[PDB]
Amino acid sequence: GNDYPIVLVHGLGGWGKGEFLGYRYWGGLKDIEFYLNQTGHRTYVATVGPVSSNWDRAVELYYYIKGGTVDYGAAHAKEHGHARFGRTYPGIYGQWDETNKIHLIGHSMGGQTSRMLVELLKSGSQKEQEYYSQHPEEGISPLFTGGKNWVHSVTSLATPHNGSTFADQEQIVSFIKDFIIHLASAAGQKQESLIYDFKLDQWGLKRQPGESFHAYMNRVMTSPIWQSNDISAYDLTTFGAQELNQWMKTYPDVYYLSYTGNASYRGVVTGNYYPIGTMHPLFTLISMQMGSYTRQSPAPVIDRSWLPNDGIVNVVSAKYPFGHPNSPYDGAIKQGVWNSFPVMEGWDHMDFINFIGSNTPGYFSIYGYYNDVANRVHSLPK
Amino acid sequence: SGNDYPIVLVHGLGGWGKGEFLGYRYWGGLKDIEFYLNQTGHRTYVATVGPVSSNWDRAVELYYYIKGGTVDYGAAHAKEHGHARFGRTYPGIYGQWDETNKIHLIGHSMGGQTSRMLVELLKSGSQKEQEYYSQHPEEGISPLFTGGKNWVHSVTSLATPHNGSTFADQEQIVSFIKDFIIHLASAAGQKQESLIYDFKLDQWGLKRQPGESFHAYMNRVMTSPIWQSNDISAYDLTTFGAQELNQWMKTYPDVYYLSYTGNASYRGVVTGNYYPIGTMHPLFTLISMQMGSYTRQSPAPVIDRSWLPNDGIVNVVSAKYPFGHPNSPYDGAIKQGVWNSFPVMEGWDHMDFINFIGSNTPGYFSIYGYYNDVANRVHSLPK
Ligand SMILES: [Zn+2]
Ligand SMILES: [Zn+2]
Ligand SMILES: [Zn+2]
Ligand SMILES: [Zn+2]
Ligand SMILES: [Zn+2]
Ligand SMILES: [Zn+2]
């Protein structure tokens, strides 16, 4: 097969190690990346902005792997009104290129972020190229010139390719506050001692020296970025995600694999969908509104196929991006199409990363599922 | 300055007592409403009752917590609902309590219902328990159930679901309490495993076992069938259950009643539904969205569009006064024997009334300003 290292890309809310002692995004109380590396699969955990745009996260993710200083694009930065340059990274895989390829594995928004990254690698950014032409004084970063075939495969796990009908209700500021409650609780850590980093430096939202966590977070959660386009909230809506699908291409020389979960069941009378008992309480009510939410207008149309969900991502959204090539898994993995594995019943949105309160139907451990996922991308031919 | 009767605060659903979370109080959170009231000339007691028990159970426990004695839920009531008749034994926080040593009952959320239930039991007692005593004198009967006690000068409800919550109508209170404990521990900066939260469900044989983890215990509580029963907070909090309670929990003509209603919901221009405001605690955002768009033709009671505005967990039309009972909107004079409905407080969510962490108190610089005015307000009632 291949020897390409895996790179894990967290989704909305995701955090790096060193943010919670003893609690990892990938495994919770377990280290998945450690299990994969010990069992012979070189695996890297990448850390990008937990709540910024997929664009912001893809650029960050490039420099995280390759090494260098984050450049979000002069045109992008002007149009959306944040700083152009972000953090500086030494790179966890500097030799990354056409022959030293990598596998992108992304949970939740990380699947969108991975596709965004492949897009930027493959086709660059026309917008930034034109801005360079009009203003050669600004420069351009290699990531935006195009022509890099550095990603062998992209694997999404409960990724809202077509958005979330929860995100449509515009309560993600509220959701993330709640998330931060639940996350600190599950890490056994005091709210007052949290060093959770929202990574919104480009918007001038850095934690000030000696500033309390709660005052810093409130500065973030009241920021008007949450009503813009350059933010996770926007990208997670069904309109916003459909809009992204129009230009984040599915490339013919890349392997795409999708995994979808369902943790909802049809009510026999209402025909609505209700969360199962194993679901985390953070998603119980979200699942209930998603299980009962249909929308004729405005576009896109939300019909009854959208009612089943994993807690926060509808099943019909996680299988493949609408309009993109796709085949349900039939035993053979096809290149250049979305290979949609069968819905995994009983799996909630957080079960994929073994968040506390974990349930992994069909397996003894979240390790046994990642064993099969890693062996699967390892099997892809060169 | 009309009277000197002390204030007794009655927490609502999930409320905890001091000695369960050090540094974090039901009344005030990081502030101490009770301490502020006692330091500013208003004698105030904090009562503690079952966080998730029925209003009956809670009212009985409330009586003994103030008066002192051993909790007696009544032989008939314990027979029909299937739990132990005798609960905890208290020394009494106000033992001299009686017709001349009256108290003000100020209850938040379900605490307002519990306060009404206690006045009912004090005033009228229980006909069921008296008939049970007549048929079986061997069993005896507690003074609470004999009646005749005018020991409460006033009842003040804050964000009380007098007519129920359409949230409670969706049978998801188990999930809501599991989420609430997560938020409460977090607010209190305490790890889940080290919680000593007491559900106070002794009467159901649901005590925490020696050396039992908090998770194992809480799971025994949340998986119990009591939650689907007739004698639990979940039941009394439905619109049918509360409006049912309103038929026999009487608004007495010699008692002063005051109600406070919050609204933290706004009408949507397109749909006409109500949505939470940005200042709402995220624990209530989804509940608010559901309630702001929920109507019910059948089964009864009928839930029409007036129920859509809410504070996060209580509909505004539920919080003003119990249906059928005497009630007047506050007009500058406080009437005895009717529900004095103060103007809806815009911007106040359900937890703002008790300064839960992350609270805001529109119209005031802190929760101490509001309770200053509430306290001087019952203080002003004539003997
Ligand atoms: Zn940006
Ligand atoms: Zn929560
Ligand atoms: Zn789970
Ligand atoms: Zn009972
Ligand atoms: Zn009964
Ligand atoms: Zn609030």
Coordinates of N, CA and C in Angstrom, one line a residue, chain A residues 122-255:
Chain A
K122 N -4.1 22.2 -4.3 CA -4.2 21.8 -5.7 C -4.4 23.0 -6.6
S123 N -5.3 23.9 -6.3 CA -5.6 25.0 -7.2 C -5.2 26.4 -6.7
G124 N -4.5 26.5 -5.5 CA -4.2 27.8 -5.0 C -5.4 28.6 -4.7
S125 N -5.3 29.9 -4.9 CA -6.4 30.8 -4.7 C -6.4 31.8 -5.8
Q126 N -7.3 31.8 -6.7 CA -7.3 32.8 -7.8 C -7.4 34.2 -7.3
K127 N -8.3 34.4 -6.3 CA -8.5 35.7 -5.7 C -7.1 36.3 -5.2
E128 N -6.3 35.5 -4.6 CA -5.0 36.0 -4.0 C -4.0 36.2 -5.1
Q129 N -4.1 35.4 -6.2 CA -3.2 35.6 -7.3 C -3.5 36.9 -8.0
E130 N -4.8 37.2 -8.3 CA -5.1 38.5 -8.9 C -4.7 39.6 -8.0
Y131 N -4.9 39.5 -6.7 CA -4.5 40.6 -5.8 C -3.0 40.8 -5.9
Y132 N -2.3 39.7 -6.0 CA -0.8 39.9 -6.2 C -0.5 40.6 -7.5
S133 N -1.2 40.3 -8.6 CA -1.0 40.9 -9.8 C -1.3 42.4 -9.7
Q134 N -2.4 42.8 -9.1 CA -2.7 44.2 -8.9 C -1.8 44.9 -7.9
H135 N -1.3 44.2 -7.0 CA -0.4 44.7 -5.9 C 0.8 43.8 -5.7
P136 N 1.8 43.8 -6.6 CA 3.0 42.9 -6.4 C 3.7 43.3 -5.1
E137 N 3.5 44.5 -4.6 CA 4.1 44.9 -3.4 C 3.7 44.0 -2.2
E138 N 2.6 43.4 -2.2 CA 2.1 42.6 -1.1 C 2.8 41.3 -1.0
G139 N 3.1 40.7 -2.1 CA 3.7 39.3 -2.1 C 2.6 38.3 -2.2
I140 N 3.0 37.0 -2.3 CA 2.1 35.9 -2.2 C 2.8 34.7 -1.7
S141 N 2.2 33.9 -1.0 CA 2.7 32.7 -0.3 C 2.6 31.5 -1.3
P142 N 3.5 30.6 -1.2 CA 3.5 29.5 -2.1 C 2.2 28.7 -2.0
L143 N 1.5 28.6 -0.9 CA 0.3 27.9 -0.7 C -0.8 28.3 -1.7
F144 N -0.7 29.6 -2.1 CA -1.8 30.1 -3.0 C -1.5 30.1 -4.4
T145 N -0.3 29.5 -4.8 CA 0.0 29.5 -6.3 C -0.5 28.3 -7.0
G146 N -0.8 27.2 -6.2 CA -1.4 26.1 -6.8 C -0.4 25.0 -7.1
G147 N -0.9 23.9 -7.6 CA -0.1 22.9 -8.2 C 0.6 21.9 -7.3
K148 N 0.1 21.7 -6.1 CA 0.7 20.8 -5.1 C -0.2 19.6 -4.9
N149 N 0.3 18.4 -5.3 CA -0.4 17.2 -5.1 C 0.2 16.4 -3.9
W150 N 0.0 16.9 -2.7 CA 0.6 16.5 -1.5 C -0.3 15.7 -0.5
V151 N -1.6 15.5 -0.8 CA -2.5 14.8 0.0 C -3.0 13.6 -0.7
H152 N -2.6 12.4 -0.2 CA -3.1 11.2 -0.8 C -4.5 10.9 -0.6
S153 N -5.0 11.1 0.6 CA -6.4 10.8 0.9 C -6.9 11.8 1.9
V154 N -8.3 12.0 1.9 CA -9.0 12.8 2.9 C -10.1 11.9 3.4
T155 N -10.2 11.8 4.8 CA -11.2 10.9 5.4 C -11.9 11.8 6.4
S156 N -13.2 11.9 6.2 CA -14.1 12.7 7.1 C -14.9 11.8 8.0
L157 N -15.0 12.2 9.3 CA -15.7 11.5 10.3 C -16.8 12.4 10.9
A158 N -18.0 12.1 10.6 CA -19.2 12.9 11.0 C -19.0 14.4 10.7
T159 N -18.5 14.6 9.5 CA -18.2 16.0 9.0 C -19.5 16.5 8.3
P160 N -20.0 17.7 8.7 CA -21.1 18.3 8.0 C -20.7 18.9 6.7
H161 N -20.6 18.0 5.7 CA -20.3 18.5 4.3 C -21.4 19.4 3.8
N162 N -22.6 19.1 4.1 CA -23.7 19.9 3.6 C -24.3 20.8 4.8
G163 N -23.5 21.0 5.8 CA -23.9 21.8 6.9 C -24.8 21.1 7.9
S164 N -25.1 21.9 9.0 CA -26.0 21.4 10.1 C -27.2 22.3 10.3
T165 N -28.3 21.6 10.4 CA -29.6 22.4 10.6 C -29.6 23.0 12.0
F166 N -28.8 22.5 12.9 CA -28.6 23.3 14.2 C -27.9 24.6 13.9
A167 N -26.8 24.6 13.2 CA -26.1 25.8 12.9 C -27.0 26.8 12.2
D168 N -28.0 26.3 11.4 CA -29.0 27.2 10.8 C -29.8 28.0 11.9
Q169 N -30.0 27.5 13.1 CA -30.7 28.2 14.1 C -29.9 29.4 14.8
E170 N -28.6 29.5 14.4 CA -27.8 30.7 14.8 C -27.6 30.7 16.3
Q171 N -27.3 29.6 16.9 CA -27.1 29.5 18.4 C -25.8 28.9 18.7
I172 N -24.8 29.1 17.8 CA -23.5 28.5 18.0 C -22.6 29.2 19.0
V173 N -22.7 30.6 19.1 CA -22.2 31.3 20.3 C -22.7 30.6 21.6
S174 N -24.0 30.4 21.7 CA -24.5 29.6 22.8 C -24.0 28.2 22.9
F175 N -23.9 27.5 21.8 CA -23.4 26.1 21.8 C -22.0 26.0 22.4
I176 N -21.1 27.0 22.0 CA -19.7 26.9 22.3 C -19.4 27.2 23.7
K177 N -20.2 28.2 24.3 CA -20.2 28.4 25.7 C -20.6 27.2 26.5
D178 N -21.7 26.5 26.1 CA -22.1 25.3 26.7 C -21.0 24.3 26.5
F179 N -20.4 24.1 25.3 CA -19.3 23.2 25.1 C -18.2 23.4 26.0
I180 N -17.8 24.6 26.2 CA -16.7 24.9 27.1 C -17.0 24.5 28.6
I181 N -18.2 24.8 29.0 CA -18.6 24.2 30.3 C -18.4 22.7 30.3
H182 N -19.0 22.0 29.3 CA -18.9 20.5 29.3 C -17.5 20.0 29.2
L183 N -16.7 20.7 28.4 CA -15.3 20.3 28.2 C -14.4 20.4 29.4
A184 N -14.5 21.6 30.1 CA -13.8 21.7 31.3 C -14.2 20.7 32.4
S185 N -15.5 20.5 32.5 CA -16.1 19.5 33.4 C -15.5 18.1 33.1
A186 N -15.5 17.7 31.8 CA -15.0 16.3 31.5 C -13.5 16.2 31.7
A187 N -12.7 17.3 31.6 CA -11.3 17.3 31.9 C -11.0 17.4 33.4
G188 N -12.1 17.5 34.2 CA -11.8 17.7 35.6 C -11.1 18.9 36.0
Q189 N -11.3 20.0 35.3 CA -10.5 21.3 35.4 C -11.4 22.4 35.8
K190 N -10.9 23.3 36.6 CA -11.7 24.5 37.1 C -11.7 25.6 36.0
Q191 N -13.0 26.1 35.8 CA -13.2 27.2 34.9 C -12.2 28.3 35.1
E192 N -11.8 28.6 36.4 CA -11.0 29.7 36.7 C -9.6 29.6 36.2
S193 N -9.1 28.3 36.1 CA -7.7 28.1 35.7 C -7.6 27.6 34.3
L194 N -8.6 27.7 33.5 CA -8.6 27.4 32.0 C -7.7 28.3 31.3
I195 N -6.8 27.6 30.5 CA -5.9 28.3 29.5 C -6.4 28.0 28.1
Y196 N -7.6 27.6 27.9 CA -8.2 27.3 26.6 C -8.0 28.5 25.7
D197 N -7.5 28.3 24.5 CA -7.0 29.3 23.6 C -7.9 29.4 22.4
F198 N -8.7 30.5 22.2 CA -9.6 30.5 21.1 C -8.9 30.8 19.7
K199 N -7.6 31.1 19.7 CA -6.8 31.3 18.5 C -7.4 32.3 17.6
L200 N -8.0 33.4 18.1 CA -8.6 34.4 17.3 C -7.6 35.7 17.3
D201 N -6.3 35.4 17.2 CA -5.4 36.5 17.2 C -5.6 37.5 16.0
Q202 N -6.0 36.9 14.9 CA -6.1 37.7 13.7 C -7.2 38.8 13.9
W203 N -8.2 38.5 14.7 CA -9.3 39.5 15.0 C -8.9 40.3 16.2
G204 N -7.7 40.3 16.6 CA -7.3 41.1 17.8 C -7.9 40.7 19.1
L205 N -8.2 39.4 19.2 CA -8.8 38.8 20.4 C -7.8 37.8 21.1
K206 N -6.7 38.3 21.5 CA -5.7 37.6 22.3 C -6.1 37.8 23.8
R207 N -5.8 36.8 24.6 CA -5.9 36.9 26.1 C -4.9 37.9 26.6
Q208 N -5.4 38.9 27.3 CA -4.5 40.0 27.8 C -3.8 39.5 29.0
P209 N -2.6 40.1 29.3 CA -1.8 39.6 30.5 C -2.6 39.8 31.8
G210 N -2.6 38.8 32.6 CA -3.4 38.8 33.8 C -4.9 38.8 33.7
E211 N -5.4 38.6 32.5 CA -6.8 38.7 32.3 C -7.5 37.4 32.7
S212 N -8.6 37.5 33.4 CA -9.3 36.2 33.8 C -9.8 35.5 32.6
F213 N -9.9 34.2 32.7 CA -10.4 33.4 31.6 C -11.8 33.8 31.3
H214 N -12.7 34.1 32.3 CA -14.1 34.3 32.0 C -14.3 35.7 31.3
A215 N -13.4 36.7 31.6 CA -13.5 38.0 31.0 C -13.0 37.9 29.5
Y216 N -11.9 37.1 29.3 CA -11.4 36.9 28.0 C -12.4 36.2 27.1
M217 N -13.0 35.1 27.6 CA -14.0 34.4 26.8 C -15.2 35.3 26.4
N218 N -15.6 36.0 27.4 CA -16.8 36.9 27.1 C -16.4 37.9 26.0
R219 N -15.1 38.4 26.0 CA -14.7 39.2 24.9 C -14.8 38.5 23.6
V220 N -14.4 37.3 23.5 CA -14.6 36.5 22.3 C -16.0 36.2 22.0
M221 N -16.9 35.8 22.9 CA -18.2 35.4 22.6 C -19.1 36.6 22.2
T222 N -18.8 37.8 22.6 CA -19.6 39.0 22.2 C -19.0 39.7 21.0
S223 N -17.9 39.2 20.5 CA -17.3 39.7 19.3 C -18.3 39.7 18.1
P224 N -18.3 40.7 17.2 CA -19.2 40.6 16.1 C -18.7 39.6 15.0
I225 N -17.5 39.1 15.1 CA -17.1 38.0 14.1 C -18.1 36.9 14.0
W226 N -18.9 36.6 15.1 CA -19.8 35.5 15.1 C -21.0 35.8 14.1
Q227 N -21.1 37.0 13.6 CA -22.2 37.3 12.6 C -21.6 37.5 11.2
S228 N -20.4 37.2 11.0 CA -19.7 37.4 9.7 C -19.7 36.1 8.9
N229 N -18.9 36.1 7.8 CA -18.7 35.0 6.9 C -17.4 34.3 7.3
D230 N -16.5 35.0 7.9 CA -15.1 34.4 8.2 C -15.1 33.7 9.5
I231 N -16.1 32.8 9.8 CA -16.2 32.2 11.1 C -16.9 30.8 11.0
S232 N -16.5 29.9 11.8 CA -17.1 28.5 11.9 C -18.6 28.6 11.8
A233 N -19.3 29.4 12.6 CA -20.7 29.5 12.6 C -21.3 29.6 11.2
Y234 N -20.7 30.5 10.4 CA -21.1 30.7 9.0 C -20.9 29.4 8.3
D235 N -19.7 28.9 8.3 CA -19.4 27.7 7.5 C -20.2 26.5 7.9
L236 N -20.8 26.4 9.1 CA -21.5 25.3 9.5 C -23.0 25.3 9.0
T237 N -23.5 26.4 8.6 CA -24.9 26.4 8.1 C -25.0 25.7 6.8
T238 N -26.3 25.3 6.5 CA -26.5 24.5 5.3 C -26.3 25.4 4.1
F239 N -26.7 26.7 4.1 CA -26.4 27.6 3.0 C -24.9 27.7 2.9
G240 N -24.2 28.0 4.0 CA -22.8 28.3 4.0 C -22.0 27.1 3.5
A241 N -22.4 25.9 4.0 CA -21.7 24.7 3.6 C -21.9 24.3 2.1
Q242 N -23.2 24.6 1.6 CA -23.5 24.4 0.2 C -22.6 25.3 -0.6
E243 N -22.5 26.6 -0.2 CA -21.7 27.6 -0.9 C -20.3 27.1 -0.9
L244 N -19.7 26.5 0.1 CA -18.3 26.0 0.1 C -18.2 24.8 -0.9
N245 N -19.2 24.0 -0.9 CA -19.1 22.8 -1.8 C -19.0 23.2 -3.3
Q246 N -19.3 24.4 -3.6 CA -19.3 24.9 -5.0 C -17.9 25.1 -5.5
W247 N -16.9 25.3 -4.6 CA -15.6 25.5 -5.1 C -14.5 24.7 -4.3
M248 N -14.8 24.1 -3.2 CA -13.9 23.1 -2.6 C -14.1 21.8 -3.4
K249 N -13.3 21.6 -4.5 CA -13.5 20.5 -5.4 C -13.1 19.2 -4.8
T250 N -13.7 18.2 -5.4 CA -13.4 16.8 -5.1 C -12.5 16.3 -6.3
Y251 N -11.2 16.1 -6.0 CA -10.2 15.9 -7.1 C -10.1 14.5 -7.5
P252 N -9.9 14.2 -8.8 CA -10.0 12.9 -9.4 C -8.8 12.0 -8.9
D253 N -7.7 12.6 -8.5 CA -6.5 11.9 -8.1 C -6.4 11.8 -6.6
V254 N -7.4 12.0 -5.8 CA -7.4 12.0 -4.4 C -8.4 10.9 -3.9
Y255 N -8.1 10.2 -2.8 CA -9.0 9.3 -2.2 C -9.8 10.0 -1.2

